[PDB]
Amino acid sequence: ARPCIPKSFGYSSVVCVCNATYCDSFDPPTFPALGTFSRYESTRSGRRMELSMGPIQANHTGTGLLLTLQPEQKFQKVKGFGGAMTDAAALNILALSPPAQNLLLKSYFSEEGIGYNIIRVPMASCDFSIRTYTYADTPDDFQLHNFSLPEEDTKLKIPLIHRALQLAQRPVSLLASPWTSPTWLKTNGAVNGKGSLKGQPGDIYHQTWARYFVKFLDAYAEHKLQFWAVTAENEPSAGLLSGYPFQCLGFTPEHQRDFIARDLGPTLANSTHHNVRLLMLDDQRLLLPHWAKVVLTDPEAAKYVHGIAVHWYLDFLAPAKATLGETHRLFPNTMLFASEACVGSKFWEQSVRLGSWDRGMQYSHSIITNLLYHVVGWTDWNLALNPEGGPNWVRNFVDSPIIVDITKDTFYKQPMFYHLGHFSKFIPEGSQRVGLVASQKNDLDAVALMHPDGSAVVVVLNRSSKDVPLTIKDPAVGFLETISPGYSIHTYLWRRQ
Ligand SMILES: *[C@@H]1O[C@H](CO)[C@@H](O[C@@H]2O[C@H](CO)[C@@H](O[C@@H]3O[C@H](CO[C@H]4O[C@H](CO)[C@@H](O)[C@H](O)[C@@H]4O)[C@@H](O)[C@H](O)[C@@H]3O)[C@H](O)[C@H]2NC(C)=O)[C@H](O)[C@H]1NC(C)=O
Ligand SMILES: *[C@@H]1O[C@H](CO)[C@@H](O)[C@H](O)[C@H]1NC(C)=O
Ligand SMILES: *[C@@H]1O[C@H](CO)[C@@H](O)[C@H](O)[C@H]1NC(C)=O
Numbered sequence: 001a002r003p004c005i006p007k008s009f010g011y012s013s014v015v016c017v018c019n020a021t022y023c024d025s026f027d028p029p030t031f032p033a034l035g036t037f038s039r040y041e042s043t044r045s046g047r048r049m050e051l052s053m054g055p056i057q058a059n060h061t062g063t064g065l066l067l068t069l070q071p072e073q074k075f076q077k078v079k080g081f082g083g084a085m086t087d088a089a090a091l092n093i094l095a096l097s098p099p100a101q102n103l104l105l106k107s108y109f110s111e112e113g114i115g116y117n118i119i120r121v122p123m124a125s126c127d128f129s130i131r132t133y134t135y136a137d138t139p140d141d142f143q144l145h146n147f148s149l150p151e152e153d154t155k156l157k158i159p160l161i162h163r164a165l166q167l168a169q170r171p172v173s174l175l176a177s178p179w180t181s182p183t184w185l186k187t188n189g190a191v192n193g194k195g196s197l198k199g200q201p202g203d204i205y206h207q208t209w210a211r212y213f214v215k216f217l218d219a220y221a222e223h224k225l226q227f228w229a230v231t232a233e234n235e236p237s238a239g240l241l242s243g244y245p246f247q248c249l250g251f252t253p254e255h256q257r258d259f260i261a262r263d264l265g266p267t268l269a270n271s272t273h274h275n276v277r278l279l280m281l282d283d284q285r286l287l288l289p290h291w292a293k294v295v296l297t298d299p300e301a302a303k304y305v306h307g308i309a310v311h312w313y314l315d316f317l318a319p320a321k322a323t324l325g326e327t328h329r330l331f332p333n334t335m336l337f338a339s340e341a342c343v344g345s346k347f348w349e350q351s352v353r354l355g356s357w358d359r360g361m362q363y364s365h366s367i368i369t370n371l372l373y374h375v376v377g378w379t380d381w382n383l384a385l386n387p388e389g390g391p392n393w394v395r396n397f398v399d400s401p402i403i404v405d406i407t408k409d410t411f412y413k414q415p416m417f418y419h420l421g422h423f424s425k426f427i428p429e430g431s432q433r434v435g436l437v438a439s440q441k442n443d444l445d446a447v448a449l450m451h452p453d454g455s456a457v458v459v460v461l462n463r464s465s466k467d468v469p470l471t472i473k474d475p476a477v478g479f480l481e482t483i484s485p486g487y488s489i490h491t492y493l494w495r496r497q
Helices: 087-095 098-109 151-167 204-222 236-240 253-269 290-296 320-330 357-372 415-424
Strands: 015-018 036-043 050-057 065-077 080-084 118-123 173-178 229-231 277-284 307-311 335-340 375-382 402-405 410-413 432-438 444-450 456-462 468-474 478-484 488-494
Touching: 015 098, 036 415, 065 375, 065 444, 065 456, 080 415, 087 098, 087 151, 087 375, 087 402, 098 151, 098 402, 098 410, 118 151, 118 204, 118 375, 151 204, 173 204, 204 253, 236 277, 253 277, 253 290, 277 290, 277 335, 290 320, 320 335, 320 357, 335 357, 357 375, 357 415, 357 444, 357 456, 357 488, 375 415, 415 488, 456 468, 478 488
Parallel strands: 065 468, 080 118, 080 375, 118 173, 173 229, 229 277, 277 307, 307 335, 335 375
Antiparallel strands: 015 410, 036 050, 036 488, 050 478, 065 432, 402 410, 432 444, 444 456, 456 488, 468 478
């Protein structure tokens, strides 16, 4: 286990400094015997996923906070965690020397790092691109004879995805999302702004756009990559907004419903890519449950839709119970998945705050809330950005868990990286959320899950300044006596037999 090299940039915590010859890492799991628990601890004060071990006791007495596992109370199975291979993320990763590149990719994808198993791939350009392009910019090419991947895919994104896959010991699921269609399929003839597909679902424009999904999946397959899922459109509501500056393609929920039932669903189902999952919405969770009711109460759209993808940007408006909770109650067999998050887009937010503990706590708080309301996965946005929070052709810069400094062949792992790793490292695909109750009112955020191998994992986040002593009870093993320091996050692991 190679320790964090801390550096302060004047914010609430430190970054971990990595370069060509040094990056912090973990040792392989030792799997401690029954009656012993593992603790991974990160703190604002500087601890970075530090391992300790403790005993499990047969008995407990006291008035302190007790959290009780309810292993019989079974909820959602986890798909996984990861981030987005944008043009910007690829340009930043490839600006490092090869050994620094490999330590960045190992930080995310290896067992010596945090075990990411999801990669979101934009279908052509987004704002985190240095130029605007689609795969079919030759005008009025309804045949899509001139559909091709440019070097952003063939030289940047695809080779980095292959390298990530090879470093990962877990199977990695790829998720594709489009921002815009070719401009000649759009009402406004532009990559951005208020504009939809021309015409109506079931017509030549919509059939062409559905076939474009199949051509993308064919082109990626020529490069030996297969997708787990695609979304119906990135943030479809954004294309309904006058002057929207980012690549977009506007759909009402009715438009998405009919596009899926008539065009996208049947087109994917009648392709070699029929096993690729389709996710609807890919948008702010305040749009639930309405968007789910509009799409999923139509059997001709419902039969194609595997899940509902959500973005976190307006979560302050949208209580989880009224959105995720209500959507799970009405549509319990349609999985919910968090497909995009980042801090810093808002005009008042500094784009990049190197070492921000607040930004880390935003991530872990969101992941815990999502898991407590039936969500099966959580996806970061750009895997890496430069210290300006780009590149970005619209100059809408944001933060990333890893910041690359090309001038020093150095990258910085922020608190967001460690807060995400407290889940991604320890909650593999197939883990199941289980019950966890508190003995009294408390300021902690906590979630319990069972690993496929039956072992327990509990994440405890303390967003308060105050140390909170607490006990965890598992009826199969006994009591963990621990303490949740102010501004900390813990992951607890233990065998149950
Ligand atoms: C990539 O990042 C690495 C981590 O920051 C950089 O390594 C640091 O490199 C400096 C410059 O050589 C080292 O400092 C020197 O340290 C030695 C003492 O060495 C011994 O003790 C230190 C702890 O004090 C220990 O880290 C070493 O293993 C040795 O046991 C002094 O003699 C010098 O006066 C000077 O202070 C750092 O120790 C070193 N840290 C680590 C953790 O390796 C590396 O240089 C970066 N590479 C590039 C090219 O940017
Ligand atoms: C521990 O738990 C058991 C429950 O079977 C209880 O009967 C026993 O007296 C407890 N031990 C102590 C020291 O309280
Ligand atoms: C588009 O495709 C056809 C046939 O493969 C080719 O002859 C034509 O010149 C291409 N157009 C452009 C603009 O590259």
